[PDB]
Amino acid sequence: ERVVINISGLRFETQLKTLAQFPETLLGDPKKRMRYFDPLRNEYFFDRNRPSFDAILYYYQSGGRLRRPVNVPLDIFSEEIRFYELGEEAMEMFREDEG
Amino acid sequence: ERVVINISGLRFETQLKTLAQFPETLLGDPKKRMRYFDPLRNEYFFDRNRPSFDAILYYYQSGGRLRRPVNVPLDIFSEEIRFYELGEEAMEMFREDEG
Amino acid sequence: ERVVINISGLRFETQLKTLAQFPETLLGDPKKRMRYFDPLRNEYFFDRNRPSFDAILYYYQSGGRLRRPVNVPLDIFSEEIRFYELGEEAMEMFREDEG
Amino acid sequence: ERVVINISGLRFETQLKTLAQFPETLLGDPKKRMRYFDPLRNEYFFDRNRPSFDAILYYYQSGGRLRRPVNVPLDIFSEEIRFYELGEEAMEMFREDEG
């Protein structure tokens, strides 16, 4: 499949297999992402920061590369990582690499 | 409840409860935002600055974090904060973080 | 009246009256913008640089201020201002500030 | 003829003749880009980085200007140049500007 993820009006579309790669995360776990599903529009909706999501999606697309865009402040971006439940392992790697 | 905010063609979506974080602002007060509403398309339309708005919306979503996008000059973002009536406190946090 | 401008897929919406302020420009002149009109979709289409268009739109929305976004290189932006035919004074005022 | 390129839900639109300015690349070659075509939607689909793609399409539109968007890191953008197969000539030149 493909899946549509709507971040505060900005629509993203990715393969189902892209998200299924990390099944423990919010987006990869069918039980966690269902809380954000909108059956009326067949999409997931998040009322959240928009610039961060390119990098959150690239984490999946790249198979594990977590990079903060230069224009997204570290505090904001770290809050999004935790929200999307990328995991402490992932955060670990990211931490060092940043500060 | 969901609300759509169209900034010069750029679509934003959020919840009524998110705008309710700051009820005395333009978007938070029904009386102030009502002149920009379009019942036909079921959205609010502003013929304004596109690159500024994701940070204005994120201010509500974060419960008060106002950060000027790097690509938007100080005086352009200053006018948008003023127009959206974000308040003296938001205007003081803007000043402090910019100089 | 409302006008839709599609820049390589990125849709901008503005009032016809916003474009009407500068009638010697490409977008303000009915005879110049007709070449890029798509009568099927009821929109103007430009197969051009996307990031520069926020500043083009700002020229109209601001009542004639021409400013270069920090992440758009000057050679690219200068080509875009020429193409949209914003004018000599516009460019000269732009030139000066820049240099 | 017009063509729609959907990069992770972000729809870019251009002309066939624009892609044909570099026939040896992925998007310029029918034999390479058809693997990403979506029969049902009449568009190409890439489950790839969004902010990189405006610069990739602009490379075609401009006739060879390849510039990394400030917000996209060097390694991520480099990977995109390779994927879209812009060529060794184009990559060499791109290496010079960053260093």
mmCIF file of C-alpha atoms in Angstrom:
data_model
loop_
_atom_site.group_PDB
_atom_site.id
_atom_site.type_symbol
_atom_site.label_atom_id
_atom_site.label_comp_id
_atom_site.label_asym_id
_atom_site.label_seq_id
_atom_site.Cartn_x
_atom_site.Cartn_y
_atom_site.Cartn_z
ATOM 1 C CA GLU A 1 0.000 0.000 0.000
ATOM 2 C CA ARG A 2 0.741 3.689 0.237
ATOM 3 C CA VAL A 3 -0.241 5.688 3.343
ATOM 4 C CA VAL A 4 -1.096 9.382 3.597
ATOM 5 C CA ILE A 5 0.069 11.334 6.637
ATOM 6 C CA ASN A 6 -1.340 14.830 7.065
ATOM 7 C CA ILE A 7 0.830 17.099 9.211
ATOM 8 C CA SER A 8 -1.195 20.228 9.992
ATOM 9 C CA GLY A 9 -2.517 20.361 6.414
ATOM 10 C CA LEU A 10 0.711 19.288 4.693
ATOM 11 C CA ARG A 11 0.110 15.918 3.070
ATOM 12 C CA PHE A 12 2.852 13.315 2.926
ATOM 13 C CA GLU A 13 2.579 9.966 1.143
ATOM 14 C CA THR A 14 4.849 6.965 1.681
ATOM 15 C CA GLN A 15 4.851 3.257 0.966
ATOM 16 C CA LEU A 16 3.327 1.034 3.673
ATOM 17 C CA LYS A 17 6.551 -1.011 3.589
ATOM 18 C CA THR A 18 8.536 2.147 4.364
ATOM 19 C CA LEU A 19 6.798 2.534 7.734
ATOM 20 C CA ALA A 20 6.542 -1.192 8.454
ATOM 21 C CA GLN A 21 10.376 -1.314 8.573
ATOM 22 C CA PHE A 22 10.240 0.106 12.129
ATOM 23 C CA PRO A 23 7.233 -1.629 13.671
ATOM 24 C CA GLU A 24 7.851 -0.442 17.227
ATOM 25 C CA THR A 25 7.456 3.234 16.333
ATOM 26 C CA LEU A 26 4.190 5.183 16.356
ATOM 27 C CA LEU A 27 3.863 5.217 12.567
ATOM 28 C CA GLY A 28 5.189 1.688 12.103
ATOM 29 C CA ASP A 29 2.889 0.119 14.703
ATOM 30 C CA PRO A 30 -0.669 -0.331 13.459
ATOM 31 C CA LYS A 31 -2.024 -0.161 17.028
ATOM 32 C CA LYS A 32 -0.325 3.161 17.796
ATOM 33 C CA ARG A 33 -1.009 4.963 14.538
ATOM 34 C CA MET A 34 -4.710 3.978 14.572
ATOM 35 C CA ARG A 35 -5.308 6.641 17.265
ATOM 36 C CA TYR A 36 -4.432 9.256 14.638
ATOM 37 C CA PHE A 37 -6.404 7.722 11.787
ATOM 38 C CA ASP A 38 -9.165 9.708 10.079
ATOM 39 C CA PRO A 39 -11.529 7.220 8.417
ATOM 40 C CA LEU A 40 -13.407 10.034 6.655
ATOM 41 C CA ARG A 41 -10.302 11.088 4.694
ATOM 42 C CA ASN A 42 -8.323 7.816 4.699
ATOM 43 C CA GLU A 43 -5.245 9.433 6.216
ATOM 44 C CA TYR A 44 -3.405 9.940 9.486
ATOM 45 C CA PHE A 45 -3.624 13.414 11.002
ATOM 46 C CA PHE A 46 -1.126 15.084 13.313
ATOM 47 C CA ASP A 47 -1.650 18.638 14.617
ATOM 48 C CA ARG A 48 2.087 19.151 14.887
ATOM 49 C CA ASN A 49 5.251 20.842 13.675
ATOM 50 C CA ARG A 50 5.573 20.778 9.893
ATOM 51 C CA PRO A 51 9.278 21.341 9.146
ATOM 52 C CA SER A 52 10.331 18.450 11.409
ATOM 53 C CA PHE A 53 8.338 15.849 9.479
ATOM 54 C CA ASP A 54 10.574 15.735 6.367
ATOM 55 C CA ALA A 55 13.346 14.391 8.617
ATOM 56 C CA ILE A 56 11.046 12.049 10.541
ATOM 57 C CA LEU A 57 9.951 10.561 7.215
ATOM 58 C CA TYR A 58 13.534 10.424 5.925
ATOM 59 C CA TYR A 59 14.423 8.284 8.961
ATOM 60 C CA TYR A 60 12.145 5.578 7.581
ATOM 61 C CA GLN A 61 13.009 6.166 3.910
ATOM 62 C CA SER A 62 16.739 5.953 4.554
ATOM 63 C CA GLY A 63 16.395 2.855 6.764
ATOM 64 C CA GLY A 64 17.503 4.602 9.977
ATOM 65 C CA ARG A 65 19.228 7.934 9.258
ATOM 66 C CA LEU A 66 17.987 10.518 11.759
ATOM 67 C CA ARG A 67 19.089 14.011 10.738
ATOM 68 C CA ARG A 68 17.932 17.364 12.108
ATOM 69 C CA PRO A 69 17.349 19.960 9.398
ATOM 70 C CA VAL A 70 19.515 23.030 10.115
ATOM 71 C CA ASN A 71 16.387 25.246 10.295
ATOM 72 C CA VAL A 72 14.567 23.133 12.894
ATOM 73 C CA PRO A 73 15.730 23.982 16.407
ATOM 74 C CA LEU A 74 17.089 21.081 18.438
ATOM 75 C CA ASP A 75 14.518 21.373 21.244
ATOM 76 C CA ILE A 76 11.597 21.291 18.805
ATOM 77 C CA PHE A 77 13.082 18.412 16.813
ATOM 78 C CA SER A 78 13.872 16.319 19.906
ATOM 79 C CA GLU A 79 10.250 16.730 21.024
ATOM 80 C CA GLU A 80 9.083 15.383 17.652
ATOM 81 C CA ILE A 81 11.442 12.381 17.807
ATOM 82 C CA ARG A 82 9.956 11.402 21.168
ATOM 83 C CA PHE A 83 6.380 12.013 20.040
ATOM 84 C CA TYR A 84 6.809 9.700 17.023
ATOM 85 C CA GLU A 85 8.370 7.072 19.304
ATOM 86 C CA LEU A 86 11.452 6.469 17.173
ATOM 87 C CA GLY A 87 12.931 4.935 20.329
ATOM 88 C CA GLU A 88 15.772 5.557 22.775
ATOM 89 C CA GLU A 89 18.227 3.638 20.594
ATOM 90 C CA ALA A 90 17.517 5.995 17.699
ATOM 91 C CA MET A 91 17.638 9.020 20.018
ATOM 92 C CA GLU A 92 20.937 7.679 21.400
ATOM 93 C CA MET A 93 22.649 7.798 18.015
ATOM 94 C CA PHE A 94 21.152 11.217 17.290
ATOM 95 C CA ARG A 95 22.145 12.669 20.680
ATOM 96 C CA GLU A 96 25.895 12.127 20.322
ATOM 97 C CA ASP A 97 25.945 13.297 16.726
ATOM 98 C CA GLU A 98 24.282 16.578 17.783
ATOM 99 C CA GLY A 99 25.400 17.750 21.256
ATOM 100 C CA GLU B 1 -13.380 20.086 15.523
ATOM 101 C CA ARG B 2 -11.060 20.729 12.561
ATOM 102 C CA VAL B 3 -10.314 24.131 11.015
ATOM 103 C CA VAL B 4 -8.690 24.933 7.668
ATOM 104 C CA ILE B 5 -6.575 28.063 7.263
ATOM 105 C CA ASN B 6 -5.587 29.008 3.731
ATOM 106 C CA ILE B 7 -2.646 31.391 3.519
ATOM 107 C CA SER B 8 -2.448 32.643 -0.063
ATOM 108 C CA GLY B 9 -3.068 29.085 -1.356
ATOM 109 C CA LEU B 10 -0.990 27.310 1.315
ATOM 110 C CA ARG B 11 -3.292 25.035 3.316
ATOM 111 C CA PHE B 12 -2.999 24.618 7.055
ATOM 112 C CA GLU B 13 -5.202 22.429 9.242
ATOM 113 C CA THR B 14 -5.547 22.371 12.995
ATOM 114 C CA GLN B 15 -8.073 21.756 15.748
ATOM 115 C CA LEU B 16 -10.371 24.312 17.362
ATOM 116 C CA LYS B 17 -8.870 23.362 20.752
ATOM 117 C CA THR B 18 -5.395 24.247 19.465
ATOM 118 C CA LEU B 19 -6.474 27.771 18.552
ATOM 119 C CA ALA B 20 -8.139 27.860 21.978
ATOM 120 C CA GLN B 21 -4.701 27.793 23.635
ATOM 121 C CA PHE B 22 -4.541 31.571 22.989
ATOM 122 C CA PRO B 23 -8.155 32.779 22.886
ATOM 123 C CA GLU B 24 -7.504 36.538 22.726
ATOM 124 C CA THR B 25 -5.594 36.269 19.463
ATOM 125 C CA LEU B 26 -7.014 36.777 15.980
ATOM 126 C CA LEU B 27 -7.361 33.062 15.250
ATOM 127 C CA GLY B 28 -8.406 32.239 18.827
ATOM 128 C CA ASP B 29 -11.293 34.737 18.933
ATOM 129 C CA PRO B 30 -14.399 33.953 16.864
ATOM 130 C CA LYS B 31 -15.226 37.665 16.561
ATOM 131 C CA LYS B 32 -11.808 38.538 15.110
ATOM 132 C CA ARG B 33 -11.412 35.639 12.673
ATOM 133 C CA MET B 34 -14.982 35.676 11.380
ATOM 134 C CA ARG B 35 -14.352 38.249 8.613
ATOM 135 C CA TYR B 36 -11.798 35.880 7.049
ATOM 136 C CA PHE B 37 -14.117 32.878 7.020
ATOM 137 C CA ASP B 38 -15.551 31.290 3.873
ATOM 138 C CA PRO B 39 -18.521 28.974 4.445
ATOM 139 C CA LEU B 40 -18.427 27.780 0.826
ATOM 140 C CA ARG B 41 -14.938 26.272 1.032
ATOM 141 C CA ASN B 42 -15.183 25.889 4.803
ATOM 142 C CA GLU B 43 -11.927 27.681 5.529
ATOM 143 C CA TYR B 44 -10.346 30.932 6.683
ATOM 144 C CA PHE B 45 -8.469 32.801 3.969
ATOM 145 C CA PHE B 46 -5.599 35.230 4.494
ATOM 146 C CA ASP B 47 -3.851 36.981 1.573
ATOM 147 C CA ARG B 48 -0.650 37.041 3.602
ATOM 148 C CA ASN B 49 2.893 35.802 4.107
ATOM 149 C CA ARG B 50 3.248 32.066 3.461
ATOM 150 C CA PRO B 51 6.673 31.267 4.955
ATOM 151 C CA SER B 52 5.730 32.885 8.276
ATOM 152 C CA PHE B 53 2.578 30.945 8.997
ATOM 153 C CA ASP B 54 3.839 27.514 10.002
ATOM 154 C CA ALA B 55 5.651 29.203 12.934
ATOM 155 C CA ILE B 56 2.506 31.158 13.863
ATOM 156 C CA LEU B 57 0.484 27.911 13.941
ATOM 157 C CA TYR B 58 3.261 26.096 15.815
ATOM 158 C CA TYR B 59 3.078 28.809 18.494
ATOM 159 C CA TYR B 60 -0.420 27.494 19.324
ATOM 160 C CA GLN B 61 0.509 23.826 18.994
ATOM 161 C CA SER B 62 3.515 24.106 21.308
ATOM 162 C CA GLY B 63 1.621 26.125 23.929
ATOM 163 C CA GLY B 64 3.712 29.211 23.305
ATOM 164 C CA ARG B 65 6.946 28.622 21.401
ATOM 165 C CA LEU B 66 7.352 31.460 18.884
ATOM 166 C CA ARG B 67 10.340 31.119 16.553
ATOM 167 C CA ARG B 68 10.880 33.157 13.370
ATOM 168 C CA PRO B 69 11.653 30.947 10.371
ATOM 169 C CA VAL B 70 15.222 31.638 9.244
ATOM 170 C CA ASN B 71 14.078 32.546 5.737
ATOM 171 C CA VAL B 72 11.678 35.268 6.937
ATOM 172 C CA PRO B 73 13.196 38.668 7.724
ATOM 173 C CA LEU B 74 12.686 40.208 11.142
ATOM 174 C CA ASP B 75 10.381 42.995 9.967
ATOM 175 C CA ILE B 76 8.234 40.644 7.843
ATOM 176 C CA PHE B 77 7.754 38.245 10.768
ATOM 177 C CA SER B 78 7.163 41.208 13.105
ATOM 178 C CA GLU B 79 4.268 42.389 10.932
ATOM 179 C CA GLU B 80 2.722 38.915 10.907
ATOM 180 C CA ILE B 81 2.918 38.605 14.724
ATOM 181 C CA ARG B 82 1.210 41.984 14.956
ATOM 182 C CA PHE B 83 -1.523 41.091 12.452
ATOM 183 C CA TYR B 84 -2.305 37.755 14.131
ATOM 184 C CA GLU B 85 -2.459 39.627 17.465
ATOM 185 C CA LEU B 86 -0.277 37.174 19.360
ATOM 186 C CA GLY B 87 -0.060 39.466 22.385
ATOM 187 C CA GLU B 88 2.507 41.402 24.393
ATOM 188 C CA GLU B 89 4.048 38.279 25.953
ATOM 189 C CA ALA B 90 4.637 36.642 22.572
ATOM 190 C CA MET B 91 5.955 39.967 21.317
ATOM 191 C CA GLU B 92 8.382 40.116 24.302
ATOM 192 C CA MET B 93 9.646 36.546 23.727
ATOM 193 C CA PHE B 94 10.196 37.441 20.065
ATOM 194 C CA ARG B 95 12.279 40.494 20.986
ATOM 195 C CA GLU B 96 14.379 38.610 23.544
ATOM 196 C CA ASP B 97 15.268 35.807 21.143
ATOM 197 C CA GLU B 98 16.166 38.198 18.293
ATOM 198 C CA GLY B 99 18.055 40.902 20.197
ATOM 199 C CA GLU C 1 -12.121 37.673 -7.800
ATOM 200 C CA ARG C 2 -9.534 35.005 -6.980
ATOM 201 C CA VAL C 3 -6.547 33.958 -9.097
ATOM 202 C CA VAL C 4 -4.563 30.727 -8.927
ATOM 203 C CA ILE C 5 -0.919 30.675 -9.940
ATOM 204 C CA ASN C 6 0.731 27.284 -10.294
ATOM 205 C CA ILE C 7 4.527 27.327 -10.098
ATOM 206 C CA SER C 8 5.772 23.849 -11.117
ATOM 207 C CA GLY C 9 2.948 22.269 -9.077
ATOM 208 C CA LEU C 10 2.983 24.730 -6.137
ATOM 209 C CA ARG C 11 -0.310 26.606 -6.040
ATOM 210 C CA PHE C 12 -0.494 30.207 -4.957
ATOM 211 C CA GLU C 13 -3.838 31.983 -4.493
ATOM 212 C CA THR C 14 -4.366 35.718 -4.398
ATOM 213 C CA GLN C 15 -6.997 38.299 -5.195
ATOM 214 C CA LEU C 16 -7.097 39.555 -8.794
ATOM 215 C CA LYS C 17 -6.990 43.033 -7.251
ATOM 216 C CA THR C 18 -3.616 42.187 -5.652
ATOM 217 C CA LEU C 19 -2.098 41.578 -9.111
ATOM 218 C CA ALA C 20 -3.981 44.517 -10.591
ATOM 219 C CA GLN C 21 -1.849 47.102 -8.739
ATOM 220 C CA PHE C 22 1.043 46.674 -11.238
ATOM 221 C CA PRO C 23 -0.363 46.465 -14.778
ATOM 222 C CA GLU C 24 2.957 46.632 -16.666
ATOM 223 C CA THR C 25 4.191 43.429 -15.035
ATOM 224 C CA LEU C 26 3.683 39.997 -16.603
ATOM 225 C CA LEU C 27 1.052 38.935 -14.068
ATOM 226 C CA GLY C 28 -0.649 42.334 -13.935
ATOM 227 C CA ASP C 29 -0.940 42.661 -17.741
ATOM 228 C CA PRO C 30 -3.794 40.610 -19.222
ATOM 229 C CA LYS C 31 -2.058 40.341 -22.603
ATOM 230 C CA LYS C 32 1.226 39.104 -21.100
ATOM 231 C CA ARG C 33 -0.195 36.577 -18.660
ATOM 232 C CA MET C 34 -2.626 35.045 -21.193
ATOM 233 C CA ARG C 35 0.228 33.031 -22.738
ATOM 234 C CA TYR C 36 0.526 31.126 -19.433
ATOM 235 C CA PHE C 37 -3.195 30.687 -18.862
ATOM 236 C CA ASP C 38 -4.644 27.197 -18.611
ATOM 237 C CA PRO C 39 -8.321 27.646 -19.478
ATOM 238 C CA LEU C 40 -9.187 24.059 -18.589
ATOM 239 C CA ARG C 41 -7.995 24.338 -14.978
ATOM 240 C CA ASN C 42 -8.555 28.090 -14.615
ATOM 241 C CA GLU C 43 -5.059 28.849 -13.386
ATOM 242 C CA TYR C 44 -1.770 30.264 -14.616
ATOM 243 C CA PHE C 45 1.099 27.799 -15.014
ATOM 244 C CA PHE C 46 4.821 28.581 -14.866
ATOM 245 C CA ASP C 47 7.489 25.849 -15.306
ATOM 246 C CA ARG C 48 9.910 27.776 -13.136
ATOM 247 C CA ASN C 49 11.786 28.144 -9.871
ATOM 248 C CA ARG C 50 9.590 27.583 -6.833
ATOM 249 C CA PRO C 51 11.362 29.320 -3.928
ATOM 250 C CA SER C 52 11.587 32.618 -5.803
ATOM 251 C CA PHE C 53 7.807 32.886 -6.171
ATOM 252 C CA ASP C 54 7.137 33.796 -2.503
ATOM 253 C CA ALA C 55 9.116 37.025 -3.140
ATOM 254 C CA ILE C 56 7.310 37.669 -6.423
ATOM 255 C CA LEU C 57 4.000 37.293 -4.616
ATOM 256 C CA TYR C 58 5.283 39.532 -1.799
ATOM 257 C CA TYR C 59 6.040 42.312 -4.321
ATOM 258 C CA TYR C 60 2.315 42.401 -5.106
ATOM 259 C CA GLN C 61 0.995 41.819 -1.573
ATOM 260 C CA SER C 62 3.279 44.476 -0.079
ATOM 261 C CA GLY C 63 2.363 47.143 -2.631
ATOM 262 C CA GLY C 64 5.666 47.104 -4.524
ATOM 263 C CA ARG C 65 8.528 45.988 -2.291
ATOM 264 C CA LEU C 66 11.030 43.724 -3.993
ATOM 265 C CA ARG C 67 13.128 41.620 -1.624
ATOM 266 C CA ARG C 68 15.300 38.537 -2.116
ATOM 267 C CA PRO C 69 14.753 35.624 0.263
ATOM 268 C CA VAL C 70 18.027 34.668 1.985
ATOM 269 C CA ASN C 71 17.978 31.099 0.642
ATOM 270 C CA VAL C 72 17.473 32.100 -2.998
ATOM 271 C CA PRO C 73 20.777 32.876 -4.761
ATOM 272 C CA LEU C 74 21.021 36.299 -6.377
ATOM 273 C CA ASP C 75 21.659 35.031 -9.919
ATOM 274 C CA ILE C 76 18.504 32.888 -9.827
ATOM 275 C CA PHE C 77 16.386 35.588 -8.208
ATOM 276 C CA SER C 78 17.570 38.232 -10.687
ATOM 277 C CA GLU C 79 16.512 35.976 -13.549
ATOM 278 C CA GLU C 80 13.076 35.540 -11.970
ATOM 279 C CA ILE C 81 12.505 39.265 -11.452
ATOM 280 C CA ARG C 82 13.344 39.859 -15.130
ATOM 281 C CA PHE C 83 11.019 37.106 -16.306
ATOM 282 C CA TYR C 84 8.083 38.430 -14.236
ATOM 283 C CA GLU C 85 8.893 41.878 -15.605
ATOM 284 C CA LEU C 86 8.693 43.687 -12.278
ATOM 285 C CA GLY C 87 10.476 46.701 -13.772
ATOM 286 C CA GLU C 88 13.619 48.808 -13.764
ATOM 287 C CA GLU C 89 12.923 50.848 -10.626
ATOM 288 C CA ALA C 90 11.915 47.678 -8.792
ATOM 289 C CA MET C 91 15.198 46.065 -9.785
ATOM 290 C CA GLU C 92 17.164 49.277 -9.195
ATOM 291 C CA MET C 93 15.687 49.576 -5.698
ATOM 292 C CA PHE C 94 16.455 45.885 -5.343
ATOM 293 C CA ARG C 95 19.937 46.333 -6.858
ATOM 294 C CA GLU C 96 20.878 49.208 -4.522
ATOM 295 C CA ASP C 97 19.936 47.529 -1.228
ATOM 296 C CA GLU C 98 21.742 44.378 -2.347
ATOM 297 C CA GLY C 99 24.447 46.271 -4.236
ATOM 298 C CA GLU D 1 2.951 17.645 -22.804
ATOM 299 C CA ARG D 2 2.737 18.061 -19.031
ATOM 300 C CA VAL D 3 3.955 15.592 -16.417
ATOM 301 C CA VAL D 4 3.278 15.140 -12.699
ATOM 302 C CA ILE D 5 6.015 13.957 -10.369
ATOM 303 C CA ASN D 6 4.810 13.027 -6.875
ATOM 304 C CA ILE D 7 7.649 13.067 -4.358
ATOM 305 C CA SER D 8 6.267 11.543 -1.145
ATOM 306 C CA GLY D 9 2.953 13.357 -1.627
ATOM 307 C CA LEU D 10 4.398 16.630 -2.917
ATOM 308 C CA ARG D 11 3.221 17.058 -6.496
ATOM 309 C CA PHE D 12 5.639 18.733 -8.886
ATOM 310 C CA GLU D 13 4.445 19.595 -12.397
ATOM 311 C CA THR D 14 6.602 20.229 -15.440
ATOM 312 C CA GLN D 15 6.754 19.705 -19.178
ATOM 313 C CA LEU D 16 8.021 16.634 -20.993
ATOM 314 C CA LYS D 17 10.344 18.897 -22.991
ATOM 315 C CA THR D 18 11.852 20.160 -19.720
ATOM 316 C CA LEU D 19 12.825 16.641 -18.642
ATOM 317 C CA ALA D 20 14.117 16.063 -22.178
ATOM 318 C CA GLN D 21 16.877 18.700 -21.698
ATOM 319 C CA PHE D 22 18.874 15.914 -20.004
ATOM 320 C CA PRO D 23 17.828 12.638 -21.689
ATOM 321 C CA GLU D 24 20.565 10.550 -20.062
ATOM 322 C CA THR D 25 19.255 11.025 -16.503
ATOM 323 C CA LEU D 26 16.591 8.991 -14.691
ATOM 324 C CA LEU D 27 13.757 11.442 -15.366
ATOM 325 C CA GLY D 28 14.964 12.210 -18.889
ATOM 326 C CA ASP D 29 15.044 8.568 -20.010
ATOM 327 C CA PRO D 30 11.790 6.721 -20.696
ATOM 328 C CA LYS D 31 13.510 3.380 -20.026
ATOM 329 C CA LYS D 32 14.543 4.480 -16.509
ATOM 330 C CA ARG D 33 11.567 6.550 -15.284
ATOM 331 C CA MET D 34 8.789 4.139 -16.260
ATOM 332 C CA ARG D 35 9.629 1.933 -13.232
ATOM 333 C CA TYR D 36 8.240 4.767 -11.059
ATOM 334 C CA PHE D 37 5.125 5.403 -13.068
ATOM 335 C CA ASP D 38 1.722 5.041 -11.460
ATOM 336 C CA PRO D 39 -0.678 3.606 -14.041
ATOM 337 C CA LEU D 40 -3.739 4.415 -12.028
ATOM 338 C CA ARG D 41 -2.771 8.007 -11.177
ATOM 339 C CA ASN D 42 -1.064 9.185 -14.371
ATOM 340 C CA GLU D 43 1.975 10.446 -12.481
ATOM 341 C CA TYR D 44 5.437 9.315 -11.367
ATOM 342 C CA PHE D 45 5.920 8.439 -7.692
ATOM 343 C CA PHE D 46 9.126 8.590 -5.695
ATOM 344 C CA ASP D 47 9.205 7.733 -1.957
ATOM 345 C CA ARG D 48 12.076 10.138 -1.457
ATOM 346 C CA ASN D 49 13.195 13.397 0.127
ATOM 347 C CA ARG D 50 10.879 16.311 -0.672
ATOM 348 C CA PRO D 51 13.038 19.404 -0.053
ATOM 349 C CA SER D 52 15.739 18.045 -2.350
ATOM 350 C CA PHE D 53 13.450 17.701 -5.334
ATOM 351 C CA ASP D 54 12.739 21.373 -6.044
ATOM 352 C CA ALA D 55 16.456 21.795 -6.828
ATOM 353 C CA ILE D 56 16.543 18.620 -8.929
ATOM 354 C CA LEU D 57 13.647 19.835 -11.078
ATOM 355 C CA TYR D 58 15.166 23.340 -11.249
ATOM 356 C CA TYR D 59 18.352 21.765 -12.641
ATOM 357 C CA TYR D 60 16.273 20.762 -15.697
ATOM 358 C CA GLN D 61 14.337 24.046 -15.919
ATOM 359 C CA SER D 62 17.471 26.205 -15.803
ATOM 360 C CA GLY D 63 19.466 24.078 -18.239
ATOM 361 C CA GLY D 64 21.987 22.868 -15.676
ATOM 362 C CA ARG D 65 22.042 24.897 -12.486
ATOM 363 C CA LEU D 66 22.474 22.427 -9.618
ATOM 364 C CA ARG D 67 22.298 23.978 -6.160
ATOM 365 C CA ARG D 68 21.741 22.306 -2.791
ATOM 366 C CA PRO D 69 18.837 23.857 -0.891
ATOM 367 C CA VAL D 70 20.254 25.385 2.301
ATOM 368 C CA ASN D 71 17.956 23.226 4.471
ATOM 369 C CA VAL D 72 19.139 19.910 2.910
ATOM 370 C CA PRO D 73 22.423 18.426 4.183
ATOM 371 C CA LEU D 74 25.274 17.715 1.784
ATOM 372 C CA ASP D 75 25.172 13.924 2.149
ATOM 373 C CA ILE D 76 21.379 13.688 1.674
ATOM 374 C CA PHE D 77 21.481 15.968 -1.364
ATOM 375 C CA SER D 78 24.507 14.081 -2.777
ATOM 376 C CA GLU D 79 22.545 10.808 -2.524
ATOM 377 C CA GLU D 80 19.676 12.419 -4.439
ATOM 378 C CA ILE D 81 21.972 13.641 -7.235
ATOM 379 C CA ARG D 82 23.240 10.073 -7.658
ATOM 380 C CA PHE D 83 19.742 8.521 -7.567
ATOM 381 C CA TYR D 84 18.429 10.877 -10.249
ATOM 382 C CA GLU D 85 21.588 10.083 -12.213
ATOM 383 C CA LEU D 86 22.476 13.648 -13.116
ATOM 384 C CA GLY D 87 25.916 12.526 -14.237
ATOM 385 C CA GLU D 88 29.559 12.675 -13.278
ATOM 386 C CA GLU D 89 29.970 16.073 -14.960
ATOM 387 C CA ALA D 90 27.160 17.561 -12.854
ATOM 388 C CA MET D 91 28.433 15.897 -9.654
ATOM 389 C CA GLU D 92 32.019 17.129 -10.178
ATOM 390 C CA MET D 93 30.795 20.710 -10.601
ATOM 391 C CA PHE D 94 28.568 20.357 -7.521
ATOM 392 C CA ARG D 95 31.557 19.181 -5.446
ATOM 393 C CA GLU D 96 33.437 22.423 -6.245
ATOM 394 C CA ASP D 97 30.900 24.847 -4.751
ATOM 395 C CA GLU D 98 30.656 23.127 -1.365
ATOM 396 C CA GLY D 99 34.433 22.658 -1.488
#
